[PDB]
Structure formats: C-alpha cells, structure tokens
Automatic annotation (TrEMBL), chains A, B, C, D:
<protein>
    <submittedName>
        <fullName>Isochorismatase family</fullName>
    </submittedName>
</protein>
<dbReference type="InterPro" id="IPR036380">
    <property type="entry name" value="Isochorismatase-like_sf"/>
</dbReference>
<dbReference type="Pfam" id="PF00857">
    <property type="entry name" value="Isochorismatase"/>
</dbReference>
<feature type="domain" description="Isochorismatase-like">
    <location>
        <begin position="11"/>
        <end position="164"/>
    </location>
</feature>
<dbReference type="InterPro" id="IPR000868">
    <property type="entry name" value="Isochorismatase-like_dom"/>
</dbReference>
<comment type="similarity">
    <text>Belongs to the isochorismatase family.</text>
</comment>
<dbReference type="InterPro" id="IPR050993">
    <property type="entry name" value="Isochorismatase_domain"/>
</dbReference>
Amino acid sequence: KRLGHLLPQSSILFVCDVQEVFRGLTFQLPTVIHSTNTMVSAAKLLNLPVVVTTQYGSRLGSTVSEISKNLENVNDVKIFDKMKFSMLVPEVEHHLTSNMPQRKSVLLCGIETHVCVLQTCLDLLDKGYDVHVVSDAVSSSTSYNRSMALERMRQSGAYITSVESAIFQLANDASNPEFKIISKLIKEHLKVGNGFDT
Amino acid sequence: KRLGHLLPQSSILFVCDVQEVFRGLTFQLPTVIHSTNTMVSAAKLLNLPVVVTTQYGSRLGSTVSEISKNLENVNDVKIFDKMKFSMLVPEVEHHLTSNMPQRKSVLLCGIETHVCVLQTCLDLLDKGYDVHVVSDAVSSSTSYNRSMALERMRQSGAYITSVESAIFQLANDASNPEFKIISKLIKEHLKVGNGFDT
Amino acid sequence: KRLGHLLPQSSILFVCDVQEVFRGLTFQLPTVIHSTNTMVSAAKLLNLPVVVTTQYGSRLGSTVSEISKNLENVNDVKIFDKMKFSMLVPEVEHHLTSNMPQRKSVLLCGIETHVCVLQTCLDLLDKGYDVHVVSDAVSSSTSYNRSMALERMRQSGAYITSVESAIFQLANDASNPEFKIISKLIKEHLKVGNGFDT
Amino acid sequence: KRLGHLLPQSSILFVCDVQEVFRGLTFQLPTVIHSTNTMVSAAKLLNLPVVVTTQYGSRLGSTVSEISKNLENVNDVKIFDKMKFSMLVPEVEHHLTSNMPQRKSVLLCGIETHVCVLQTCLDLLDKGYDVHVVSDAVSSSTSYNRSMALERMRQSGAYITSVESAIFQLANDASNPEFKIISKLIKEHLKVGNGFDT
C-alpha cells in the first residue's frame, strides 16, 4: 500500500537551502517563503522536529530572515551546513537515526525543486522514508524545472501534497485540542494568494 | 490488477460535507452541487446506498438545500455528523461492515478535495475499498488544491472518474431495463455546462 | 515490466462506434475520423485485422462514410452491432479467441473516450490484453471527459499512444519492404493538422 | 525501488538522430540543440561515453553542425548510422556490451520523442537499463507528440528528467573537483531561454 498517512508523532519537517542569494531568481519565491513559514509555524503547533539545511553558506548566505525568526521559537531545530546537494548527509542521517528513529514521514520544503529537493527525496526514499513534497513550498529558477521535479519525484514514490493538505492531514480531527489554533494559522495563511494557482 | 470496474450491487455513494457556509467560497461549487445531485439521482435509479456526512454542523451549517432535498427520496440513506476530517468515523464504518460488507466500491463526491475527500479516500483504501473520485463532483477553495488532491489520491490508487463515466460504468449495457430512465438523467445533466471544463 | 511493444503479427485494430449521430456532438470530431482512417489504412499495409462496432446502429446510425469507404479494401474486417457499452461482447470475444488468439495487443480508436472506449479498455485488460489507446483517434462530447478518460485508462495500465507513434512502432525498420508505402501514409496524414495539437 | 539515481561511472549519454532535415520541422529545435550540447559537454566533464546515431544519414543528412562541432571536443564518442528506428541496433548494443557492460544508466536526448527516442527507451528498458529522458533535450514535429511520448515513456518506467536536474545529480556534491567547471556550464545553460517553458 502507498497511502502516505501523516501522524504528528511520526513526522518531521525538512527545509532545504532557502538562502538569500536565491532571492529574486527563484520562480514565485514569495509563495515559497510564505508557505515554508506556515509549515514551520505548524511544526511548533504539532511538536514537529525541523531539520534546516544550507548549501555552501559561506558564499551563498544563510537562511532568509523570514524563516530564521520563525525558527527561534521551535523546540527541536537543528541546522546543518552541507555541500552535498542532498540533505541526507551522514550528520543529518545520524540525527534522524539517533534522536528520532520512529519518525519515517518527512515533509519536504525548500529550493531548488530539481536539485536539492529532488536529491534529498530520492535518498530519503532509498532509506525507507515516506517523502511528502509540499508543492506549495518548493520551486526552482524556472517553472519548467519545478513542474518536472514534482512529477519526477512522484514517479519514484513521493507523495505530492500542499501546505493546507499536509497540515489538515496532521490535524486529522477538528475536535482535537490544537484545531482552534490550527484554524487561525490556516486562516492567516489564506490571506496571501498562492503564486502557483494559475 | 487495478481495473476499477463498477457494479451497482457492490457500489456505494459517499457525499462529503457539501455544507452551506462553503457557498460562494468553493471553486465552481455550483458544478459540485449539480454533479453530486446527478450522482444521488443516479443512486436512486441503480439502488445504490448513500452515506452523507456533515463536518461540525453547528458552525459550517447543514448540507446545502439542493442536495438535502434530493436526498429525501432515496431508499437507503443515513446522514452522519462528524468532527474527524475523514468520513470513516466508527459510526460510519459500523454501517458499512454490519449493513453492506459486500459493497467495496465507493463513489466519492464532496468538498474539500484536499481535506475531507482526501482523508476519506486514504482511509477507505486502507480498508481494502475501491475509491472512485468523481472528479467533476469534488472541489476546494482554490483550483490549485483541487488539482493537487486529485493526483494525490490517484497516486495512492484511487480511480479518477467523472459523473458520466461512472454512471455509464454502472449501467454497463443499453439493453438493461433501467437504461431508459438513466438516459433521461444524463440528458438533463447535460443541460448545464461543466465549470471545470476549460 | 510494462513496455507496450507493438508487433504486427500480434496486433489488432479496434474501432469504437464512430457513427453519424456523433457528427455534431464530439469534441474535435474531424481529427477523430481522420486519425482513425489513418489507422485503418495502416492496418491494410501491415496486415492487421480490424474489429469495428456500432452502438445501437438501428437508431444511432452506421459508421461514418469516410471510414466505411476505407474499410472496403481491408482484408480482415468484422463489424458487430451491440448494446453493451464495452466492445468485448461475447460474439466479439469469440472472434478473438477462435480466430486470432496470438494477437494480444489492441489498438484502440473511437468514441466516446469515457464511456465505450474506457469500458472496452477495462474489459480487455481484464483478459490479459495490452491496450494501446490511440489518443489521436479518441474523444468525447467534452474535452473534460476525454482528458479524464485518457488518464483513467492509463492508471489501469493502458498505453496512451498516438497515430504516428503506434504506426512507427509497428513499422520497426526503415529498411523493411513496408517502409516506403508507410511513409506515403504518414506524409498524407500530416497534411491536415492535428486538432489536438494546441 | 524506482529511484533512478545517476552515477557518472555507470552512466552513458545517447543523442538520437538530430539531423539536418528536421531543421524547421521539429518543434522548438533550437532548445533541443542547446540542451543536447549542454549534455554533451557535461559528458566530457564527467567522463561519460557518448553514443550518437543518424537515421538514413545519406538522405536525411548528418548531425547538425552545432552538435557536430561540440562532439569534436569529447574523446569518448561513437557515431553510428542506422535504419532501425530504435538506437539499440546490434552495432550499438555490441559497443555497450563489449566496452561498457557496467554502465546501465542512459541519458536520452534527440528527436523524435515518439519515434526514435521512444523505441530506444523501450528497447533499453527491456534490456534492464535505467532510461532517463532529458525532457529539455527531446522534441517531435508537433508539441502534441512530444508531450504524449514523455508520459508514454514515464508510464513504462523511464525517468523524466531535465538537463539541469540530470547534471546536478550526476555531480552529486559541490565539493567535487569538477564542480567549478560544471557550475560554469550550468551558468551558461541557465542563460538560454527554455522553448518548452510556457
């Protein structure tokens, strides 16, 4: 079975290579940034660990300030500086195996869809993880490479979801104690248009 | 094999959360209401049981009047009030197992594609059901989440059909004695356009 | 493995209900007639048996004159009248089993994609046939139900091909004794534009 | 697992029949030429063998001068003339078997998507190869047939990739010694508009 159920206690958020250099070059970057912050804010509300990564941070900068300020509150965040395109460096793999072996569901955000996101996805699939690509929160230099990467990841087994669909999947019940604050986050997230909804 | 054949003896119609508060907010909701009503009228002709659900009725309202009026005439209908996003709440599942264990094909209509339709679809597939998503009878607040959700369900095994394709599948032969009145239903259904046809 | 190779010795062309009633109801109908006629012409050059059907011919009319004229010179044709939406009526299925059991690759053309083409495709896949849907030569009353049906069939394993692609698969080698006449057919086919190429 | 990892040591580049008569006939031919040249240069940098074919070369012409001149810089190139539409002629297959049996990943470029690229991909899949179609670097006479063939090949197990995505996963790591010249190659490639990005 390939169902891609999402449980808060079995899930972890991945944010890939959202640097300041790629500002002004990524297709629909404001949507990518706004959507990723909604995921991060959701990660706090359902106690999801967050793994954040930077690619050649020396000559490409750090994570953009919009998400960096959001990440301060989150209880469990570890930031990895890498130069492998895939996020699954031995340090990240050890983090997942040593501190959260029961979490086999990865919610994947970041850029570029067809470079770091894709390679992270395939390595995660190789290691037996369920990969959930948040299509709202991934993009590339061109729209062509974003749409291609989504389908290329899909044909390898990755579930392609959205910010709202993933979050309501993790909520699973409006009668849960967290639903009221989940709804506020969703309502606030809807106040900005989706740049990919063409 | 993954054929998605539809037999009236082993089929059942699900109507998810088509409620008043979504009037004027959901993408092409009138097409959703009209297509769902055709499916409900079709279930009367082919004697399909109907399961209807409402999500937090005291805030989102009851089922829209057009569908609730059409549900008056159906022989086998039960309406459930629920807080879980998925329709497979224990009261609904108790109905399926204790009343119709032989019906393992679910025709799914309603809103939203990416929240309650999706989670119903995943849970139904978990229990060995065949899920046929009536694509022109499901929708979301944005077209983006609708299209994403349809492919997200198809990637898990759900069959993506339409009102005409699914109804003609159930009929299976124009020589059957029910085809004369099924034809009348299709002809009336075609008097209005498809809001998703662009 | 699902390669969908096409060999003339094991292939047969199916033409589904291209009748006069639809000359006024079907999206991109002229392309459907033209592409189907190219398939019939190719069936003659490659010695492919052809199975044609009519749905309720007493009321819906016979095959369109453009195709019926082209069928006169075809060596192996058998035309069946049916009320069942699927083309795989017992009389048809007897013809395949008794007279050409070695041919398990079916080239599928006709209308409508979502009713009679799809139900034929599902029944053929049930009996172990490889189904090649000629997307160039199938359509519905609406573009929505054609595109839906194409993916709905592919999701079950049907190979979605085109008039040029299927023909050139069968004409494996340009050094074959058939290539010169096959080229004359393709150049004639390309003289009138593919209406689906939008 | 259908991951489709790409390793330079086990990968080979195929260029299908980019000849001199298809100028003015192939949809977005300039993009196909530029994308293939980027692949050819990447093969040189990553020490990937290159196999080029021409179909009926005497009457269809040689490989286009843009790609022909670039092949002058690559040491490991083999150019063959063929009558068979598929690239897997015995001469080409013997070159693979007796000179690089360890390379079972193929990056596929050229024209036409639905005739020569497709049949090459099907034959390669039949022989246990991973086929990666560089969607950036394939096209047909019509947009319709290229789009069809891409999904017709993905449906059979081929990975649908792009020039940038395939190259970056071949490089695997930004700390590799060849990354600097690869980044220059990618930088030049990003400056050319994508004819299929619309």
